[PDB]
Design a protein around this nucleic acid. Structure first.
Lengths: 247, 50, 65, 91, 72, 101
RNA sequence: UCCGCGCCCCGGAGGACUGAGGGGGAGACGGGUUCCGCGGCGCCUGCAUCUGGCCGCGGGUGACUCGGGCCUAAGCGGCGGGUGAAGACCGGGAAGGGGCGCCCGCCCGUCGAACGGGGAGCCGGCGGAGACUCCGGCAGGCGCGGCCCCCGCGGAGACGCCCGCCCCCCGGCGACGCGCACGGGGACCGCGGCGGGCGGCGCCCCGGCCCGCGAACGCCCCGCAGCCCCCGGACGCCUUGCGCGGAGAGGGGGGCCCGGGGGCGGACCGCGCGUCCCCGGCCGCCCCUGAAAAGCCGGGGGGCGCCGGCCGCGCGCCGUACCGACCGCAGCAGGACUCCGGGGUCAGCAGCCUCUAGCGCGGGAGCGAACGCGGCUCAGGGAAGUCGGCAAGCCGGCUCCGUAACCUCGGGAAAAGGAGUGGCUCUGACGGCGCCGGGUCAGAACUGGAACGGACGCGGGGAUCCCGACUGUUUACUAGAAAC
RNA sequence: GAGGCCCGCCGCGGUGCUGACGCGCAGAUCGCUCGUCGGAGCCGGGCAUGGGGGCGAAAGACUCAUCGAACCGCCUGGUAG
């Protein structure tokens, strides 16, 4: 047989992210003494576009607490933030869109984004266009806060973890049809070599497990076990159920 | 090529300097009889640096 | 080219290009619009025509009146 | 006038291609993307899209984050209200 | 090259600053109103066009014996 | 009858820095003079408007008086921006006193 | 082709061709002396040779301003260490920089681009071979010294004015997409006129042709649009399209930038339509947002003394000939990256002819069989031929009529189908007025073997049925498909 | 003045003639006729990916005239009823 496309992808080499001309790593401002007690004030210098990200980014300039200059942070932009806004990242921060406060401080029912999976992780959950997490409940004895991830799954994260108030901007980007293959090529060129996609039933027996016969058929069931081998997991992995259904 | 390097030019200039026939007096001194250098190269039929 | 000026060699048989290609119907518009906007502007500056009329006439000129 | 009788108003470019469903959807998104929106500061209908999510008011000279195809998205309008109600309630 | 300020600056440069040579190029192509004086300095060659030969003479008067004249 | 010309640059590839302007020389020949890309004048750091008073020449070949505007924060901030900065600073100090009083 | 030593060499005369995406002039790369002059034909020049890219002999590449070098890009290497039997491979967490008293300081690229970024070159000449390099002029850049001088003013403002440096901070320039239009310059082009030089002339000809040059740079003045300032307080101001204005329009006066134009210095006169290149203000576009740094320069705060001017000198290293000569066994209908691009006809950079420039390809003579290849025409019929209209042919430019079913309402559609088209002599339009400058759109007479897109270029059309929605992609060297 | 729109030059492909050639001009060229010609476009330089591996709009295609497993040397004068 031949190594399949999935196997060839993990060595990078042509399938590595097209990261040239990307602004930088969008991350929440680092936790600092002035964040832990009180709030640091930043000004949104610019709202720009990341090459591979649908959501707009934002250059917010905070003062340098450590020294004498000014430090620039790159943040995923909540909708409604504007150039020349004053954004406060702190334990004592007001509940306005853009501000970063610890999740215990954030009240229940609040739309939050760029939430930290664990305190001082500088950003993890709810970072894509339109996506948000909501505060569900706070256990003040366990210092833990339940949040609902955009998937629906409920995660108990430390009350110390920080989040930016608001819903990420770029909302409703996938509503528009791509319409042409060309529009897809332009989107993927800013991302990685994953497009165009050839179906395995199109490929010859060597190239893919679905492979090929006199007629294009999946042969055995597409469902594969979770404990498949690395070149064998190709169809629906560990499917609990398959098929279109109600709900 | 017009934008060559001195180190490529100097190894090429050795070949131009040594693409010479045996001096006639050398044939007479050594009774060589064979008067062809045989290490001589003609640009069109040759591929130096290959 | 002296005959052409008189109008000797410019008939339908001697034309090999579309009327828009021979003379662009866009460059004929720019000229007319400029010529008429120059006339109306001078009249407004001279006080011959009112500011309000100038606007009404300016729109009708833009509307191929 | 009314050069295109049906809703092929901005989708005349696509011609006889892509199917009716795609063209109908594109009518709504395209008309929204090239529309002028009212800047919450200039209060003038001069906001136009620069990129997906980035909108600039030509007079106010202020760039604001927004929905990919509209200056303001319905989910966002609701969130701002929920955050305001919760904020006012906390104080 | 430049045009020297009247014979105001021309004679000031002639007195002290580099004046390696002056050329009284009268009759440039045998033309009238044509006395062009070309001061060579270190920085630039300067030319003052003077209306009359007599006008040129007043500037030639006071030309240093050290300053060298050439005539075309 | 031929005014065709040959490249002045080291290689024929015509890039942004490889553009020529044709003039006729004293000896009746078309010559290719190089066209240097215009450097651009300083733009206000706040806002983005070109700073008035500074020519679009590389700053090194400019002269100190030419490369400066006689104003506080002159080649950095445009006047409207500077007056906003002055006003914002003064007003903040005046509101702080009112908070204390 | 003719004559001249007469060779396919060279010179003159003809007759032509490549035809400005060139058989033209130049570079990148690859070759590496092929370059130049002189001689020569033994090799080679698939015929010849007196020729030559061949052979012998002697020569030939000159840079402060051009490129390398330098910067960073994708990348690649380095790193206390980390692994592996090793060879090697992997890598930030590791007391990682300097003088004197101090001070400041987490941590690598003197890697990587003769197209990206960069401090600065123009003219004229000269040689057998070269030139942005030589030489003659004229300039610009960056530094090193001598000498002298000396630490801000003006404005209502936007600005203006010859001006300091170091540190730390903040910023700018370097620095950026694509497009249809529209504007402005430059070059080119064409038209007159005048001035100079020709050629033809059977008749005409002030009707033909050739030439008429002005660089970088340095001062001064202008420069649309744009962006600002000051008064003031509104339906207006405006574009080709737009756009704009109580967050200040219009109007009035100003400031700035403008790869540009003029004037002088360096050193023939007018006009027009285009073409090409640059540039501008827009407007459109994107689930696409169109590099970075070296370097240079402002600004804030601290320190702290510069600053200039003038006059000398300096600028090291390497590349620099030539290419129909590269790579395919070859002096091979094959490939091979650019740059600059005249005239006529034309919508055209198409086709067809031409100026400039180049130049007659492993040879020539006869003869005019079959047959073959590349074409041409064919009476009457008009696919009866054939697996099948394969091949050929019809059709076609433009203008004005007219145009169906169906349809996802965008299409179909150039549906289908008609009619005209030349040349002359005019007549209106249209901006242009001191009337001057356009070449298109109409309309008209008169013509002519019953012609006119007269060459050239340049859909045959319709009725269905099956697939695959589409534009795309594919088996280099037998399958372009319904496959992907 | 919009379009992975149409006609059409170069370009880039390569349909048909199953034309020429087939001891070639050529180990795939030639002539017409063509597909496309603002785009999932075309083209140069640098760079990345390596052999049971790569890369593949998928043809078992392509990887230096070599691909249903490149090439070079060796094991190897492999073994053969």
């Amino acid at each position: 047989g031949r190594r399949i496309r999935v196997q060839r992808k993990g060595a990078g080499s042509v399938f590595r992210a097209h990261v040239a001309r990307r602004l930088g790593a969008a991350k929440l401002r680092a936790n600092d003494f002035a964040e832990r007690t009180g709030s640091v004030r930043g000004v949104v210098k610019a709202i720009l576009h990341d090459r591979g990200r649908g959501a707009p980014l934002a250059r917010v300039q905070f003062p340098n607490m450590r020294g004498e200059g000014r430090v620039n942070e790159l943040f995923i932009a909540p909708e409604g933030m504007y150039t020349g806004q004053e954004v406060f990242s702190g334990n004592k921060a007001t509940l306005h869109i853009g501000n970063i406060l610890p999740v215990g401080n954030i009240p229940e029912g609040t739309y939050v984004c760029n939430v930290e999976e664990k305190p001082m992780d500088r950003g993890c959950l709810a970072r894509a266009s339109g996506t948000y997490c909501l505060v569900v409940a706070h256990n003040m004895e366990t210092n833990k806060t339940r949040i609902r991830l955009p998937s629906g799954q409920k995660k108990l994260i430390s009350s110390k973890a920080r989040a930016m108030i608001g819903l990420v901007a770029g909302g409703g980007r996938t509503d528009k049809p791509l319409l042409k293959a060309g529009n897809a090529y332009h989107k993927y060129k800013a991302k990685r070599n994953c497009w165009p996609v050839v179906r395995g039933v199109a490929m010859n027996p060597v190239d893919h497990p679905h492979g090929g016969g006199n007629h294009q058929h999946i042969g055995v069931s597409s469902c594969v076990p979770r404990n498949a081998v690395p070149g064998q997991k190709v169809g629906l992995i560990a499917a609990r159920r398959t098929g279109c259904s109600g709900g | 090529t017009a934008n060559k390097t001195l180190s490529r030019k100097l190894r090429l200039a050795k070949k131009t300097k040594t693409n010479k026939n045996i001096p006639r007096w050398v044939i007479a001194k050594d009774h060589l009889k064979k008067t062809w250098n045989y290490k001589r190269h003609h640009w069109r039929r040759s591929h130096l640096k290959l | 080219h002296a005959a052409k000026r008189l109008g000797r060699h410019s008939g339908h048989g001697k034309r090999r290009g579309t009327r828009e290609a021979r003379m662009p119907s866009k460059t004929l518009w720019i000229q007319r619009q400029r010529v008429l906007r120059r006339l109306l502007s001078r009249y407004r500056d001279d006080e011959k025509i009112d500011r309000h009329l100038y606007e009404t006439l300016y729109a009708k000129a833009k509307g191929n009146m | 006038m009314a050069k295109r009788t049906k809703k092929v108003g901005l989708t005349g470019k696509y011609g006889t291609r892509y199917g009716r469903a795609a063209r109908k959807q594109l009518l709504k998104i395209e008309t929204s993307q090239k529309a002028k929106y009212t800047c919450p500061f200039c209060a003038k209908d001069k906001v136009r899209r620069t990129a997906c999510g980035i909108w600039t008011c030509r007079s106010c000279s202020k760039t604001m984050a927004g929905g990919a195809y509209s200056l303001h998205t319905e989910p966002a309008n609701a969130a701002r209200a929920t955050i305001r109600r919760l904020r006012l309630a906390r104080e | 090259p430049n045009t020297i300020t009247e014979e105001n600056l021309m004679k000031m440069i002639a007195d002290g600053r580099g004046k390696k040579l002056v050329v009284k190029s009268c009759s440039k192509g045998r033309l009238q109103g044509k006395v062009k004086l070309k001061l060579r300095t270190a920085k630039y060659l300067y030319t003052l066009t003077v209306p009359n030969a007599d006008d040129a003479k007043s500037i030639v008067k006071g030309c240093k014996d050290k300053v060298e004249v050439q005539y075309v | 009858a031929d005014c065709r010309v040959t490249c002045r640059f080291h290689s024929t590839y015509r890039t942004r820095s490889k553009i020529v302007r044709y003039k006729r020389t004293p000896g009746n020949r078309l010559t290719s003079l190089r066209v240097k890309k215009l450097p651009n004048a300083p733009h206000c750091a706040e806002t983005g408007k070109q700073i008035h008073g500074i020519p679009r020449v590389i700053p090194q070949h400019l002269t100190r008086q030419q490369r400066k505007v006689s104003r506080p924060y002159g080649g950095k901030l445009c006047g409207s921006a500077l007056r906003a900065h002055i006003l914002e600073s003064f007003l903040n100090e005046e509101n702080q006193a009112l908070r204390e009083i």
